[PDB]
Symmetry: C2
Subunit: 234 residues, 2 copies
């Protein structure tokens, strides 16, 4: 069907390596990226810490698994993935597709720092959180912002779902695309997600616009997600 | 201020009068219809029974409060309201706006009739339920069909929210309320809503297309809603 990009990190305590997974497909099913689509993920996923952006390495039984170079202390970090810009033809016209994913990882049951996670990373279409997902109970408001080319993106629809919401009769041709939240961004680009359950959540946004250089391509489509945790697994 | 149209019903046991309300504004705050938009609601709300559609009586303190002419027996009915077609200029082109609202009313406890609540009443854009909400608990799929001009509508975004989900912004931004559900219809216009908390629920779908007679108006917009209850 349709393929979107997201990131998922396993529960990590202090002193360990950070195991992360790049999902290209239908959330939340992790699946290996096909050989004809290996070139669209040219660069490895990055990990954001107090020192900056670090390249992760690809190690595991499947090609979507990554681990950090060195173990990290307790804290709260981001892990980002990118679908490299590619060109396609539709009907006819050219269109450049790009996709982005960012996951908030809280290593340690006590850390909920906001210094690293709230700073934008430079994704063309980016969802920047303004709080820590661990500070939000069910029913509270999780305030985030939507940026496009650096500036805020007003009047942009942000939806959100979680693992376990849409599950009935799913297969290759059924969606499990039902969302547990939907709203629009204000003039400052901000919006508040309201989670009614606990688990692993993904908030999605998209933006189709005109390509800057019309002598090369005409349209542009960006699909961005942000993944986090509501509640506590351990 | 968006000003969307929906409907609301009170706790009614079989035998007494059916008192309903027409909301024209931001859900769920009821507010009287201003004098400059009375003409858009020239036709009163209708109530459907086994006897068919019957008009209601706009009697009460405010001009949005309606009462049933005939006391109703126990069962399951629908109450409908219409924002009549108006023309506006946008940019420069013409757009015809029509809006609709429908409420499932279960009068009397243990009322789960589906004889008439699942029948299309004939709204240009319509949200026809395929189940009684009283039989739907928390976390259970509620299958609804979306009709446009009689035939189903595929790939239409249906959202749903409930009273108490969003508690902010009385008139600061006047933007749309936060939704607690969002999905799209399949090839037969069907979609399953998943209510995660008990309360007074309202679902919405909108459709913007061309106008049939291009020598009169160019565009057309329809905003249709469906209100019901999930426990208490
Ligand atoms: Co633990
Ligand atoms: Co009672």
């Amino acid at each position: 069907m349709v393929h979107r990009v997201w990131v998922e990190t396993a529960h990590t305590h202090g002193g360990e390596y950070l195991k992360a997974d790049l999902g290209y497909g239908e959330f939340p099913e992790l699946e290996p990226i096909a050989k004809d689509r290996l070139h669209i993920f040219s660069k490895p996923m990055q990990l954001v810490t107090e020192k900056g952006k670090e390249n992760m390495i690809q190690r595991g039984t499947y090609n979507y698994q990554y681990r950090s170079n060195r173990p990290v202390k307790d804290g709260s970090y981001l892990v980002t993935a990118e679908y490299q810009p590619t060109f396609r033809s539709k009907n006819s016209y050219c269109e450049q597709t790009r996709m982005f994913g960012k996951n908030i990882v809280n290593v340690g049951h006590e850390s909920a720092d906001t210094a690293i996670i709230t700073k934008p990373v430079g994704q063309n279409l980016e969802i920047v959180p303004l709080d820590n997902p661990a500070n939000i109970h069910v029913g509270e408001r999780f305030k985030v912002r939507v940026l496009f080319r650096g500036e805020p993106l007003p009047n942009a629809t942000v939806t959100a779902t979680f693992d376990g919401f849409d599950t009935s009769d799913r297969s290759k041709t059924h969606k499990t695309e039902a969302q547990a939240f939907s709203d629009t961004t204000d003039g400052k680009g901000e919006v508040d997600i309201i989670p009614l359950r606990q688990g692993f959540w993904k908030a999605s946004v998209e933006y189709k616009a005109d390509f800057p250089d019309q002598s090369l391509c005409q349209k542009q489509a960006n699909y961005t997600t942000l993944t986090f945790q509501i509640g506590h697994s351990h």
